């Protein structure tokens, strides 16, 4: 059966590479100093942010904190698209009842977004604009309340998560585990979801033993990270509700509204 779990690890890694254009491997090459990739422009104060608008080519007049809020929406919407495409490659996912597919995505996308965003972070800041830019943790922390408090729990989680030193092939199986959670609210057929996740769990466990043979209990350490993930979602939802009440000239992207509607 080991050969089957290895073929599943290989399948998920291959689909991960095809679904996510900016991998952890490329993110680390950018952050460290490697010559396979090029150096980002660093935004650290109000001054350099304006220089960065003219220096960084962005994919997508208001206040600075508002402009960053809107920027993260566009990337997050893109992330949902990438995650959805990846979910369809997880064997058995598309054969599930359609309402459960929707439900698994609705509750899984943000847990995956924060997981993969850790690949883009270090203790000092986060890559932006497919890695062309780098915004510092202290600069985001200084933005006017309550916008300045949006990213800090993500950084704190990323520092703990990155200490596990997972690579993309590990992360491919782990985010599949996250998607296939039989405990999501409103699921209709829990059993076929759990059966798929049990297989994904055995594949993840084997991958972690083979890939990190001197990292004891990495499987257990990784699984316990779900506590931090859900706390982030919880806090993030709370801050979004403050923004909704204080900025009535803004709305979340419709795709994100649907994800957050009746969540928990
Ligand atoms: C002023 S510093 C800041 C403040 C607010 C935001 C707002 C954010 C918004 C709307 C989203 C969209 C979603 O929740 O899906 C998001 C996703 C993330 F990973 C991280 C941050 C944010 C981003 C940065
Ligand atoms: C041209 S005025 C501007 C406005 C906002 C930004 C800031 C951000 C943008 C575009 C993004 C999207 C991405 O990463 O591609 C982002 C993601 C994050 F976690 C944190 C901050 C930012 C840069 C420039």
From Swiss-Prot:
Keywords: Activator, Biological rhythms, Cytoplasm, Diabetes mellitus, Disease variant, DNA-binding, Glycoprotein, Isopeptide bond, Metal-binding, Nucleus, Obesity, Phosphoprotein, Receptor, Transcription, Transcription regulation, Ubl conjugation, Zinc, Zinc-finger
Post-translational modification as stated in the protein's UniProt record: Phosphorylated in basal conditions and dephosphorylated when treated with the ligand. May be dephosphorylated by PPP5C.
NR LBD domain mapped to chain residues: 4-262
UniProt keyword annotation of Coiled coil present: no
Location relative to the cell: Nucleus; Cytoplasm
GO molecular function: alpha-actinin binding; arachidonate binding; chromatin binding; DNA binding; DNA binding domain binding; DNA-binding transcription activator activity, RNA polymerase II-specific; DNA-binding transcription factor activity; DNA-binding transcription factor activity, RNA polymerase II-specific
Function (record text): Nuclear receptor that binds peroxisome proliferators such as hypolipidemic drugs and fatty acids. Once activated by a ligand, the nuclear receptor binds to DNA specific PPAR response elements (PPRE) and modulates the transcription of its target genes, such as acyl-CoA oxidase. It therefore controls the peroxisomal beta-oxidation pathway of fatty acids. Key regulator of adipocyte differentiation and glucose homeostasis. ARF6 acts as a key regulator of the tissue-specific adipocyte P2 (aP2) enhancer. (Microbial infection) Upon treatment with M.tuberculosis or its lipoprotein LpqH, phosphorylation of MAPK p38 and IL-6 production are modulated, probably via this protein.
Subunit structure: Interacts with FOXO1 (acetylated form). Heterodimer with other nuclear receptors, such as RXRA. The heterodimer with the retinoic acid receptor RXRA is called adipocyte-specific transcription factor ARF6. Interacts with NCOA6 coactivator, leading to a strong increase in transcription of target genes. Interacts with coactivator PPARBP, leading to a mild increase in transcription of target genes. Interacts with NOCA7 in a ligand-inducible manner. Interacts with NCOA1 and NCOA2 LXXLL motifs. Interacts with ASXL1, ASXL2, DNTTIP2, FAM120B, MAP2K1/MEK1, NR0B2, PDPK1, PRDM16, PRMT2 and TGFB1I1.
Illness: Defects in PPARG can lead to type 2 insulin-resistant diabetes and hyptertension. PPARG mutations may be associated with colon cancer. Obesity: A condition characterized by an increase of body weight beyond the limitation of skeletal and physical requirements, as the result of excessive accumulation of body fat.
Designated name of the protein: Peroxisome proliferator-activated receptor gamma
Organism: Homo sapiens
Section covered of the full-length record: 235 to 505 of 505
């Amino acid at each position: 059966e080991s050969a089957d779990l290895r073929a599943l690890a290989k399948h998920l890694y291959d689909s991960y590479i095809k679904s996510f254009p900016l991998t952890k491997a490329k993110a680390r090459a950018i952050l460290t100093g490697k010559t396979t990739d090029k150096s980002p422009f660093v935004i650290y104060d109000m001054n350099s942010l304006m220089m960065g608008e003219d220096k960084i080519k962005f994919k997508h007049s208001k206040e600075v904190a508002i402009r960053i809020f809107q920027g993260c929406q566009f990337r997050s919407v893109e992330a949902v698209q990438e995650i959805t495409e990846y979910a369809k490659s997880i064997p058995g996912f598309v054969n599930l009842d359609l309402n459960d597919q929707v439900t698994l995505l609705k509750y899984g996308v943000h847990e995956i977004i924060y997981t993969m965003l850790a690949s883009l972070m270090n203790k000092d800041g986060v890559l932006i604009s497919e890695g062309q830019g780098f915004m510092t943790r202290e600069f985001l922390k200084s933005l006017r309340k309550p916008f300045g408090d949006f990213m800090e729990p993500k950084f704190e989680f990323a520092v703990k998560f990155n200490a596990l030193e997972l690579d993309d092939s590990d992360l491919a199986i782990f985010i599949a585990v996250i998607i296939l959670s039989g405990d999501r609210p409103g699921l209709l057929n829990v059993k076929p979801i759990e059966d798929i996740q049990d297989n994904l769990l055995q594949a993840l466990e084997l991958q972690l033993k083979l890939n990190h043979p001197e990292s004891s209990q990495l499987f257990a350490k990784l699984l316990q990270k779900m506590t931090d993930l859900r706390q982030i979602v919880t806090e993030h939802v709370q801050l979004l509700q403050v923004i909704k009440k204080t900025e009535t000239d803004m709305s979340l992207h419709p795709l994100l509204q649907e994800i957050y509607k009746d969540l928990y």
